[PDB]
RNA sequence: AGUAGAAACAAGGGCCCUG
């Protein structure tokens, strides 16, 4: 591995992507957590936090957050990004039976 | 990107594009709706989730 | 700090007004873009004359005020005017000044800790200088250079991306607090974003300039130019100082910023996967997609996914075209027929079957188009502009530079149009074993003849002989081609003109969607077969470096 | 679902497709142009004649079928009622261009070229400014001798010019180049001869009767015959000036490859040839004088400033013998002034006035513009003098372009290296010096024979051509040089036995002869074009005598 | 001796010297013109059939399918036979393929719908229907959206279709308000003012804002069509058309039979705009849009009818004067009728026939075209003629092909005998006369192969680069110090690559540009003896500079650039040698001057002063609105530093984004940064008060 | 850090690694070595008889 | 006076300003 690209593990010349769910001393930055978060149903009770404080939030905890420009959303720190291609392909094949 | 199908292919998977296209042709409606119908189908698929 | 309070007080004053409140309240933020145009609208007919007229004036430069006071820049250093208290009418936050001020600022003004950051901002231009320093210039000569007008790229670039992907790169390398929701690209290529981020973080810079320069950094400038010799971005950036229509400045530029070896490796990998995924007759396509997705390759420092590279690339080659088709990428209006290139200038047609007896009586159906059709062609160091008509080659005009390449181009073209008696009455040698089903898949007649010609030169000579030979009339001796591709002869192939100078490559900025069959036959919304697996090298062994075939 | 929808909404909002149009609900599924009552009322009125409603036109067009028989019949009927003429030039020859008739075209360029007599003074780097140079030249005392006589040799309005010359000399002594507003300056500068606008609401038939009122009777230009003096100016401008370095040029940068050394050697040779002529002296005089006048009109409008007509040059380099390291020189062809240059708008107008020296008798036909004044004597021995006082006018555009007359070098170099590289390529060898020294280029006739001289001496002819194009440019020359190309193409067709043809050449000749008026260059070039076609008729066809 | 410079054409090729004729080294150089245009337009239409409109109640001459007066047809005729035009369209459709036009109108509709209504700002000057003056596109757009807002309610639209439907609704409205130093106008005056087209003498048209979007739609479809065609050269430029011509010539020299022989004809159509009719365009656009979505059918049809009802404005009127020319009266177009007696006989004779059409300061013209409006649709219509082919020609063994761009074409005729060449050319002329397209007989000429001209490019075995055409490009643009020299060098590079400019000419032009640059910006070398402002202080502090080589040209530098280094700005070549003090000072982003294109950003990249003539004119009311928008944009950029580069997007309004972002920044800096709870509370209270005021006010 | 011809050396280094990977010490392409060996002297030659 | 062209300039705005 290398400190430059902290998102790859080379096992016998095979690249194993590490998910970006938690920062490390070298890799620590705003990016190393982005995969962990996801959007969910809006809840106005949860707090509004800073981008830097994202590191401190608990797993499975909701939080509101300003995103980009003129967008206020709700993020829940649970990684739910399944493969989209596989599901669509499988379902579409069934339509042909 | 000169036709709508490419714009839908930018994010949507091409299969749902072809599906919504065939559906629009069967109904005979404008193809401008390839964007909405494809989205409607992908949700359904990713709703199933196997 | 107090500046924050100033911004808030300004916002309060703005909201106290009525019109500003309306325009802020209504609609979304995109209106900003619109508002960005209704202001600062002023152009000038002849800019040169205006600038020369202005510069005579005592104070031709608007400038900031507080920055000048802070920098202790006085109005006059020594009986020389530099600026005077006033307000520019349009801005209302600037003061007139003179150009001399820059010189003073340049020679005794405020100095920053380090200016080496510019070398990163304009990495393209410093790369240009570094490449130029390694060119060993040999010797100017004089001769009438043959130039072909073709589309090329004039900037060596690594990790070429699209406009959509780049926009996030600027936001995620400079303005993170206002970054949009994380995209797929940013997650996939996080080593590049980290590398760019480190250089331009905690630095005093005009952020917009850096973003624009990264935009130019990732844009391969494609131009339609006259060209001679090899085609490499390293040359096209300074072709103006290598040769013209009448002169040539020889120079060796092979070993600078090699960009061709990675294109070659990508095509080799695509060939390998396409040849692997032909085993599964029923589900070759799905196997191909899975094979592409579960593979990657190293580019410089970063490791990139093959699927994205194929989408970005512009190699109009039969190997890549099929893979782009499977993923769904749109591609250029460029046909292929073996190791040959084609481009339909005009015409039309419709399939029409005809029988061919292979040996004695053995009917084999083959389809032939039925209309006039012009076609540019391109074989190695040769080019053509042929035309067909109802299963007949009407004419062919060649402008190449080699005899062997000329013969091969003519033969593959004749095959393309299924002209000649052999298509009516197959050659005796070809048998039913080779006709079809090498691995259980039928091979149409044309590809059988193509393999026949490749197998032996004698077959090629026989095919060319099939086209009628006549006596070279007077005058036309120069525009004639024998069997050995002679410039002139006493007897020559019928209706085979020859000229000097490569035929200019056509151009069209069109994108056609094309599907592919279960047998990897790429249809393009019409009968045409743009590409197939029967126009690739048979097989070869290679040891790929810095690649990842993570599949069982 | 919500992550996918967020991404989708971002990628739609980016493309301006997040609207009801592309994402409508169940009801709002019928988008249509909001056809208004008036738009339809108009569309039903703009229909072609046979139809009377957009519906009929649309129904007739959507089903239109091709009937080639009728289309061919109509095409043949139109092909018979026309009878388009076709005229092969070989049978129907080009009559000679007709030039107008009348008095000789008169000199019009601001600055005299051949006649102008100049005063030189050793260069002072410290004092390099316009006013400072004029002061230095005036102080020696040669200038203070001039004392024009009351009666001029020719011309009109003499007293005004004499008064203004005296005022200029008085100005320099005071070291303030500002002229007062007096009757002479007013008349020459037209300070107050600008018509005062009259409102229409304040008009009546009585006012119309009191002072004549009728649409301005535009006085178009009058025709002038060919100038017999242009050739002399050309021949003189093709000779050396006893000095060099007339026009300012920059330095030569370093070199790394053979190509740059070749470019720098060719450029050095051409610049050496071109810096010694007299035309280039005029290039320098225009660049410097117009630069100074531009920077005065910009700074001191409303003040009838005094600007010199000068230039800077360098004495030639003899052998090492004698005085080495040749010096520089400041020349003073004459003096100019500029009435108020209140250039409120682009392509303005501002009268100027030009005094210039001479040692030659004035022609009546050529020097009609000027109003000469015999002015004492001058050493070289002693020689009479003649003070040529014009009252011309300039604009912004002429200023900017004259200050960029240096363009001629580019065009001439391109033509010469377009001939030399082409001749060198046909042989695949460095043939430039041989081409320059040897290749003979016809440049005229003398004693009924065709003169010829190498290219190295016809670069001067090309340069004069480009310079004069810069000087005399107008609408006439533009139209002419744009319409003469057809004749040259016909000439080429004649040279290569290509049976060219045309539809109505007489009209072409008419168009040409219409745009030949009171501009010496046009008329001279046309006379040469006729002599050319004549000389070629001996070895070619398609032209009548 | 009698010096003659043309003698070089006796023994030297004419192309290799044609550049010498072009006088591009020197400076280049109403109502009477417009009236002559009107007269010629009404004359070309040979017919006399006149309808009477109801909307306007003005006789409307019908310029289509009413041909009469078949005398001297050689001259320009502007009558059109729709049958022939549609037949030619059918021939082109058949050659190109089935459903050729549907794909094109689809590729247009793919853009017209998503297009933003702000892309009308990037256009030539457009007539304003409020002040009655030509004005940049942006100001006119803002003015018409302010009129909309004042009339009924803020324009919620954001796209082209909404804008077009809002213009169509605006035609119906009885009354329309618009801001001014706040007049109101009835429906008829705005109906006339929308169609009115002004003129600029740059002549050229200036259509109203109302028509502009439909014109863009039609041009988009015509462009999408033309790009496909191989017999046109309008969208393309430079090398592409040369390659087209060369391939065409190869095709020709191969197709023709031994008995046959080719010919060329350089053609230059006449009265292109005067003879084109928008009614034929209307029918053609109807035929093209016969299968496509019903949406495009209506949208495309608008612009032709609007142009078919267009008025044309007369500008500046006549001028009156006395004999001595001391006094002088000025009179506008509206008052011409009153002083009909006080004009020359020619002017009266020209004016009197058009009085019936004339309306106040306008002349209703039921047809005709003007320059620049519909370039590509005429190119399509003209490419139609080249395709034509009938049994008679093939029976005689004759065929014509060619390449046409706007009002300039090239013809390649083939036959077996001259008697048939002439007949072929006459047939082509006839088919072109059937659709208004004429041909000039004087400026047009022909010859045996390999001697033509097309758009200032003369052709032979080679193609002589004009060079003259690109000579004006060798000038300092006058943007700033950094931009000018780099742009000039890049221009030299392009001219070198394409127009085969020589190396020595390039070096000479580069030196000319460096010396004109030194002169314009009042700079000169350090070693020179020149005095003045910049040079004096340069000399004062020159001693500090250890390394002379790195010195910048604006700061007493020397030339370190050549033919092999034209693609590299000087700031880069000189970087290593530059001293550290000078380097850091020059490239310090904290610059008052620097304002933000292959160039480096230094202190030299300044902006020029602003004009002040408006200072006296009462054009200030607009400055207030511009300043309002300027302030809003300025502080949105103050918060968001990536507002201009990356287009903002979201669902929040500007105010809400500012409110939330400011509060979040305040919280982040109170957490760690130097802010006190009192200050944080004050800021938050200020924001709450401002929000409440904003919402309550409006 | 301090060098005149970096690119050729770095490309030759990658070439060495790629060749060693192929289990053959040979280098097929001859572009960089040729340059770095010819900077000292490389040029054409004209016969005396053609002089 | 003059320029140039197929019409415009030969200062314009409020005693004061400006390209």
Curated annotation (Swiss-Prot), chain A:
State the compartments where it is located: Virion; Host nucleus
**What is known about what this protein does?**
Plays an essential role in transcription initiation and cap-stealing mechanism, in which cellular capped pre-mRNAs are used to generate primers for viral transcription. Recognizes and binds a wide range of cap structures of target pre-RNAs which are subsequently cleaved after 10-13 nucleotides by the viral protein PA. Plays a role in the initiation of the viral genome replication and modulates the activity of the ribonucleoprotein (RNP) complex.
Subunit composition and interactions: Influenza RNA polymerase is composed of three subunits: PB1, PB2 and PA. Interacts (via N-terminus) with PB1 (via C-terminus). Interacts with nucleoprotein NP (via N-terminus). Interacts with host ANP32A (via C-terminus); this interaction promotes viral RNA synthesis.
Q: Which protein family is named in the record?
A: Belongs to the influenza viruses PB2 family.
Protein name per UniProt:
Polymerase basic protein 2
Placed within the complete protein, the shown segment runs: 676 to 772 of 774
From Swiss-Prot, chain C:
Question: Coiled coil located at which positions?
Answer: none
Indicate yes or no for the key word 4Fe-4S. no
Annotated GO biological process: 7-methylguanosine mRNA capping; cap snatching; DNA-templated transcription; symbiont-mediated suppression of host gene expression; symbiont-mediated suppression of host mRNA transcription via inhibition of RNA polymerase II activity; viral RNA genome replication
Q: Which UniProt keywords apply?
A: Cap snatching, Eukaryotic host gene expression shutoff by virus, Eukaryotic host transcription shutoff by virus, Host gene expression shutoff by virus, Host nucleus, Host-virus interaction, Inhibition of host RNA polymerase II by virus, mRNA capping, mRNA processing, Viral transcription, Virion
Keyword Magnesium attached: no
Q: Out of the domains of life, which is the source?
A: Viruses
Q: Where in the cell is it found?
A: Virion; Host nucleus
Q: Which GO terms describe its cellular component?
A: host cell nucleus; virion component
A GO molecular function held by the record: RNA-directed RNA polymerase activity
The job of this chain, per UniProt, is described as:
Plays an essential role in transcription initiation and cap-stealing mechanism, in which cellular capped pre-mRNAs are used to generate primers for viral transcription. Recognizes and binds a wide range of cap structures of target pre-RNAs which are subsequently cleaved after 10-13 nucleotides by the viral protein PA. Plays a role in the initiation of the viral genome replication and modulates the activity of the ribonucleoprotein (RNP) complex.
Give the UniProt family note: Belongs to the influenza viruses PB2 family.
Q: What is this protein called?
A: Polymerase basic protein 2
Q: Which species expresses this protein natively?
A: Influenza C virus (strain C/Johannesburg/1/1966)
Counting on the full-length protein, the chain here runs from 1 to 552 of 774
Swiss-Prot record, chain D:
Q: Name one GO molecular function term.
A: metal ion binding
Which cofactors are reported in the record for this sequence? Answer: Mn(2+)
The cofactor note from the UniProt entry for this protein is: Binds 2 manganese ions per subunit.
* PTM characteristics: Phosphorylated on serines and threonines by host kinases, including human casein kinase II.
Q: Keyword annotations for this protein?
A: Cap snatching, Endonuclease, Eukaryotic host gene expression shutoff by virus, Eukaryotic host transcription shutoff by virus, Host cytoplasm, Host gene expression shutoff by virus, Host nucleus, Host-virus interaction, Hydrolase, Inhibition of host RNA polymerase II by virus, Manganese, Metal-binding, Nuclease, Phosphoprotein
Enzyme class name: hydrolase
The signal peptide here is none
Q: Name one GO biological process term.
A: symbiont-mediated suppression of host mRNA transcription via inhibition of RNA polymerase II activity
Q: What is its main location?
A: host cell
The family assignment reads:
Belongs to the influenza viruses PA family.
What is the purpose of this protein?
Plays an essential role in viral RNA transcription and replication by forming the heterotrimeric polymerase complex together with PB1 and PB2 subunits. The complex transcribes viral mRNAs by using a unique mechanism called cap-snatching. It consists in the hijacking and cleavage of host capped pre-mRNAs. These short capped RNAs are then used as primers for viral mRNAs. The PB2 subunit is responsible for the binding of the 5' cap of cellular pre-mRNAs which are subsequently cleaved after 10-13 nucleotides by the PA subunit that carries the endonuclease activity.
The protein here is known as Polymerase acidic protein
Q: Which gene encodes it?
A: PA
Curated annotation (Swiss-Prot), chain E:
Q: Name one GO molecular function term.
A: RNA-directed RNA polymerase activity
- Chain ranges of the RdRp catalytic domain: 249-445
- Partners and quaternary state? Influenza RNA polymerase is composed of three subunits: PB1, PB2 and PA. Interacts (via N-terminus) with PA (via C-terminus). Interacts (via C-terminus) with PB2 (via N-terminus); this interaction is essential for transcription initiation.
Q: What is this protein called?
A: RNA-directed RNA polymerase catalytic subunit
Q: Which Gene3D superfamilies match?
A: 6.10.140.720
Per the UniProt record, the lineage of the source organism begins with: Viruses, Riboviria, Orthornavirae, Negarnaviricota, Polyploviricotina
Reactions accelerated catalytically: RNA(n) + a ribonucleoside 5'-triphosphate = RNA(n+1) + diphosphate
Role description: RNA-dependent RNA polymerase which is responsible for replication and transcription of virus RNA segments. The transcription of viral mRNAs occurs by a unique mechanism called cap-snatching. 5' methylated caps of cellular mRNAs are cleaved after 10-13 nucleotides by PA. In turn, these short capped RNAs are used as primers by PB1 for transcription of viral mRNAs. During virus replication, PB1 initiates RNA synthesis and copy vRNA into complementary RNA (cRNA) which in turn serves as a template for the production of more vRNAs.
Gene encoding it? Answer: PB1
């Amino acid at each position: 591995w290398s400190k430059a690209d902290s998102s790859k593990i080379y096992c016998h010349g095979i690249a194993i992507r590490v998910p970006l769910v938690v920062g490390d001393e070298h890799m620590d930055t705003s990016l190393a957590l982005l995969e962990g978060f996801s959007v969910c149903e809006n809840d106005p009770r949860a707090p509004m936090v800073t981008r830097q404080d994202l590191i401190d939030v608990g797993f499975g905890q909701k939080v509101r957050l300003f995103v980009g420009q003129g967008s206020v959303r709700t993020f829940k720190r649970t990684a739910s990004q399944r493969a989209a291609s596989s599901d669509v392909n499988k379902n579409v094949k069934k339509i042909k039976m | 990107s000169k036709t709508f199908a490419e714009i839908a292919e930018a994010f949507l998977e091409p299969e749902a594009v072809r599906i919504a296209k065939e559906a629009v042709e069967e109904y005979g409606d404008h193809e401008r709706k390839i964007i909405q119908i494809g989205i409607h189908f992908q949700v359904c698929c990713m709703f199933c989730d196997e | 700090m107090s500046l924050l309070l100033t911004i808030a007080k300004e916002y309060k004053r703005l909201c106290q007004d009525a019109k500003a409140a309306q325009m802020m309240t209504v609609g979304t933020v995109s209106n900003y873009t619109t508002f960005k145009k209704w202001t600062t609208s002023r152009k000038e007919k002849n800019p040169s004359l205006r600038m020369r007229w202005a510069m005579s004036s005592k104070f031709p430069i608007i400038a900031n005020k507080r920055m000048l006071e802070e920098a202790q820049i006085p109005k006059e250093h020594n009986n020389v005017a530099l600026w005077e208290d006033t307000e520019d009418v349009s801005k209302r936050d600037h003061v007139l000044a003179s150009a001399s001020c820059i010189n003073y600022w340049n020679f005794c003004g405020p100095c920053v800790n380090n200016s080496e950051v510019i070398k990163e901002v304009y990495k393209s231009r410093f790369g240009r200088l570094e490449r130029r320093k390694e060119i060993m210039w040999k010797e100017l000569r004089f001769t009438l250079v043959d130039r072909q007008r073709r589309r090329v790229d004039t900037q060596p670039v690594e990790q070429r991306l699209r406009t959509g992907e780049i926009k996030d790169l600027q936001m995620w390398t400079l303005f993170e607090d206002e970054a949009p929701l994380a995209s797929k690209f940013i997650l996939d290529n996080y080593g590049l974003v980290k590398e760019m981020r480190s250089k331009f973080a905690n630095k005093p810079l005009n952020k917009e300039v850096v973003a624009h320069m990264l935009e130019k950094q990732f844009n391969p400038e494609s131009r339609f130019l006259p060209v001679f010799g090899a085609i490499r971005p390293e040359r096209m950036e300074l072709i103006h100082a290598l040769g013209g229509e009448t002169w040539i400045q020889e120079a060796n530029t092979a070993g600078i910023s090699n960009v061709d070896q990675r294109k070659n490796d990508i095509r080799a990998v695509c060939r390998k996967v396409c040849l692997a995924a032909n085993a599964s007759i029923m589900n070759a396509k799905s196997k191909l997609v899975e094979y592409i997705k579960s593979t990657s390759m190293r580019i410089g420092e970063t490791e990139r996914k093959l699927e994205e590279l194929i989408l970005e690339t512009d190699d109009v080659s039969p190997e890549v075209t099929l893979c782009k088709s499977a993923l769904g990428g749109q591609l250029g209006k460029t046909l292929s027929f073996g190791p040959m290139l084609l481009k339909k200038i005009s015409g039309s047609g419709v399939k029409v079957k005809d029988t061919v007896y292979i040996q004695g009586v053995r009917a084999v159906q083959f389809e032939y188009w039925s209309e006039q059709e012009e076609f540019y062609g391109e074989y190695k160091s040769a080019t053509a502009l042929f035309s067909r008509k109802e299963r007949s080659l009407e004419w062919i005009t060649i402008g190449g530079g080699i005899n062997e390449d000329r013969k091969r181009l003519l033969a593959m073209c004749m095959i393309f149009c299924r002209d000649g008696d052999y298509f009516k009455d197959a050659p005796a040698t070809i048998t039913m074993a080779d006709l079809s089903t090498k691995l259980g898949r039928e091979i149409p007649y044309q590809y059988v003849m193509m393999n026949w010609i490749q197998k032996s030169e004698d077959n090629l000579e026989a095919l060319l002989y099939s086209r009628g030979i006549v006596e070279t009339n007077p005058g036309k001796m120069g525009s004639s081609m024998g069997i050995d591709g002679s410039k002139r002869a006493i007897k020559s192939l019928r209706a085979v003109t020859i000229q000097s100078g490569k035929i200019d490559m056509p151009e069209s900025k069109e994108k056609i969607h094309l599907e592919l069959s279960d047998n990897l036959e790429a249809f393009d919304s019409s009968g045409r077969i743009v590409a197939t697996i029967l126009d690739l090298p048979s097989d070869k062994k290679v040891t790929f470096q810095d690649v990842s075939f993570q599949h069982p | 679902i919500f992550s996918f929808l967020a991404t989708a909404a971002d990628f739609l909002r980016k493309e301006n497709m997040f609207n009801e149009i592309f994402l409508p609900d169940n009801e709002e599924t019928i988008i249509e142009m909001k056809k208004g009552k008036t738009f339809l009322e108009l569309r039903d009125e703009s229909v072609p004649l046979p139809f009377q409603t957009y519906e009929q036109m649309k129904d007739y067009c959507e089903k239109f079928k091709g009937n080639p028989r009728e289309l061919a019949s109509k095409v043949s009927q139109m092909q018979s009622n026309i009878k388009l003429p076709i005229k092969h030039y070989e049978q129907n020859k080009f009559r000679q261009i007709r030039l107008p008739k009348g008095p000789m075209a008169p000199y019009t360029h601001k600055f005299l070229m051949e006649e102008a007599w100049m005063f030189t003074k050793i260069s002072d780097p410290e004092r390099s400014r316009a006013g400072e140079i004029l002061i230095d030249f005036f102080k020696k005392g040669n200038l203070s001798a001039i004392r024009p006589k009351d009666k001029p040799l020719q011309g009109k309005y003499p007293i005004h010019y004499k008064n203004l010359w005296n005022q200029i000399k008085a100005a320099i002594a005071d070291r303030t180049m500002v002229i007062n507003e007096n009757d002479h300056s007013e008349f020459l500068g037209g300070i107050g001869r600008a018509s005062k606008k009259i409102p229409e609401i304040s008009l009546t038939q009585d006012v119309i009767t009191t002072e004549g009122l009728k649409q301005s009777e535009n006085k178009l230009p009058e025709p002038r015959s060919f100038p017999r003096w242009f050739n002399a100016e050309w021949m003189w401008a093709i000779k050396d000036s006893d000095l060099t370095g007339w026009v300012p040029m920059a330095e030569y940068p370093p070199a790394d490859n053979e190509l740059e050394d070749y470019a720098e050697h060719l450029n050095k040779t051409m610049e050496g040839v071109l810096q010694g002529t007299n035309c280039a002296r005029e290039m320098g005089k225009c660049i410097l004088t117009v630069g100074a006048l531009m920077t005065e009109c910009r700074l001191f409008p409303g003040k009838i400033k005094v600007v010199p007509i000068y230039a800077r040059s360098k004495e030639r380099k003899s052998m090492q013998e004698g005085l080495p390291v040749p010096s520089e020189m400041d020349c003073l062809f004459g003096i100019c002034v500029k009435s108020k240059s209140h250039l409120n708008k682009d392509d303005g107008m501002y009268t100027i006035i030009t005094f210039e020296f001479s040692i030659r008798e004035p022609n009546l036909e050529k020097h009609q513009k000027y109003t000469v004044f015999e002015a004492g004597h001058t050493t070289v021995r002693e020689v009479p003098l003649y003070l040529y006082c014009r009252t011309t006018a300039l604009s912004k555009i002429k200023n900017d372009w004259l200050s960029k007359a240096r363009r001629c070098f580019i065009t001439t170099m391109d033509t010469v290296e377009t001939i030399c590289l082409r001749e060198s390529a046909k042989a695949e060898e460095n043939l430039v010096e041989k081409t320059l020294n040897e290749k003979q280029m016809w440049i005229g006739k003398k004693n009924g024979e065709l003169i010829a001289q190498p290219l190295r001496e016809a670069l001067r002819v090309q340069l004069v051509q480009q310079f004069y194009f810069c000087i005399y440019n107008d609408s006439q020359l533009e139209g002419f040089c744009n319409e003469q190309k057809k004749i040259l193409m016909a000439l080429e067709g004649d040279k290569k036995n290509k049976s060219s043809f045309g539809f109505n050449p007489e009209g072409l000749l008419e168009k040409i002869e219409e745009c030949l008026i009171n501009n010496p260059m046009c008329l001279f070039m046309a006379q040469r074009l006729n002599e050319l076609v004549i000389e070629a008729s001996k070895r070619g066809a398609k032209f009548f005598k | 001796m009698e010096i003659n410079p043309y003698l070089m054409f006796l023994n030297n090729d004419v192309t290799s010297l044609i550049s010498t004729t072009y006088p591009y080294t020197g400076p280049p150089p109403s109502t009477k013109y417009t009236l002559e245009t009107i007269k010629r337009t009404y004359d070309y239409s040979r017919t006399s059939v006149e309808k009477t409109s109801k909307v306007f109640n003005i006789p409307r001459r019908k310029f289509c399918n009413c041909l009469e007066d078949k005398d001297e047809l050689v001259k320009p005729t502007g009558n059109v036979d729709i049958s022939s035009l549609l037949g030619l369209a059918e021939m082109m459709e058949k050659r190109m393929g089935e459903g050729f036009f549907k794909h094109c109108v689809m590729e247009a509709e793919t853009e017209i719908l998503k297009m933003h209504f702000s892309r009308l700002t990037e256009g030539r000057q457009t007539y304003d229907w409020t002040s009655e003056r030509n004005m940049p596109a942006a100001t006119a757009l803002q003015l018409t959206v302010d009129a909309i807002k004042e009339t009924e309610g803020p324009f919620k639209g954001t796209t082209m279709l909404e804008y077009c439907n809002k213009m169509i609704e605006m035609l119906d409205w009885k009354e329309i308000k618009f801001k001014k130093v706040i007049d109101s106008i009835k429906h008829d005056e705005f109906l006339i003012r929308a169609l009115t087209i002004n003129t600029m003498a740059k002549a050229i048209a200036t259509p109203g804002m109302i028509v502009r979007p439909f014109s863009k739609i039609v041009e988009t479809v015509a462009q999408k069509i033309c790009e496909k065609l191989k017999e046109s050269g309008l969208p393309v430029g430079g090398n592409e058309k040369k390659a087209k011509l060369k391939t065409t010539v190869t095709s020709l020299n191969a197709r023709m039979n031994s008995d046959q022989f080719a010919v060329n004809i350089t053609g230059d159509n006449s009265k292109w705009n005067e003879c084109q009719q928008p009614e034929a365009y209307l029918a053609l656009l109807a035929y093209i849009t016969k299968d496509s979505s019903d949406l495009m059918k209506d949208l495309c049809s608008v612009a032709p009818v609007l142009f078919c009802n267009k008025f044309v404005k007369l500008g500046q009127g006549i001028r009156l004067s006395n004999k001595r020319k001391t006094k002088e009266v000025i009179i506008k177009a509206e008052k011409m009728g009153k002083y009909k007696n006080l004009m020359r006989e020619e002017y009266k004779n020209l004016f009197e026939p058009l009085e019936k059409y004339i309306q106040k300061d306008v002349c209703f013209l039921p047809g005709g075209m003007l320059m620049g409006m519909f370039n590509m649709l005429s190119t399509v219509l003209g490419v139609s003629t080249l395709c034509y082919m009938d049994e008679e020609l093939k029976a005689k063994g004759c065929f014509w092909t060619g390449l046409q761009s706007s009002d300039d074409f090239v013809l390649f005729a083939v036959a077996s005998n001259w008697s048939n060449i002439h007949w072929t050319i006459r047939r082509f002329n006839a088919v072109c006369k059937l659709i208004g397209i004429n041909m000039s007989l004087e400026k047009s000429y022909g010859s045996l192969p390999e001697l033509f001209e097309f758009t200032s490019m003369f052709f032979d075995g080679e193609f002589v680069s004009n060079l003259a055409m690109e000579l004006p490009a060798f000038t300092t643009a006058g943007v700033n110090e950094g931009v000018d020299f780099t742009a000039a060098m890049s221009i030299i590079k392009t001219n070198m690559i394409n127009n085969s400019l020589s190396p020595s000419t390039a070096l000479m032009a580069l030196r000319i540009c460096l010396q004109e640059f030194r002169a314009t910006y009042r700079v000169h070398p350090w070693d020179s003896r020149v005095k003045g402002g910049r040079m004096k202080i340069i000399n004062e502090f020159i001693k500090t500079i250890e390394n002379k080589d790195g010195l910048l040209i604006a700061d007493g530098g020397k030339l370190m650039n050549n033919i092999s280094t034209l693609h590299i700005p000087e700031e880069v070549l000189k970087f290593e040698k530059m001293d550290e003090q000078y380097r850091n000072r020059v490239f310090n982003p904290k610059n008052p001057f620097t304002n933000f294109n292959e160039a480096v950003v230094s202190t030299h990249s300044f902006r020029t002063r602003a004009n002040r003539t408006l200072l006296n004119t009462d054009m200030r009311a607009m400055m207030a609105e511009e300043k309002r928008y300027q302030m809003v944009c300025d502080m949105f950029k103050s918060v968001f530093e990536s507002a201009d580069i990356n287009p903002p997007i979201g669902a929040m309004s500007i105010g809400e984004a500012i409110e939330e972002k400011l509060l979040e920044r305040a919280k982040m800096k109170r957490d760690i940064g130097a802010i006190e709870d009192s200050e944080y509370e004050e800021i938050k209270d200020i924001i709450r008060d401002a929000k409440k005021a904003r919402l309550e006010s409006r």
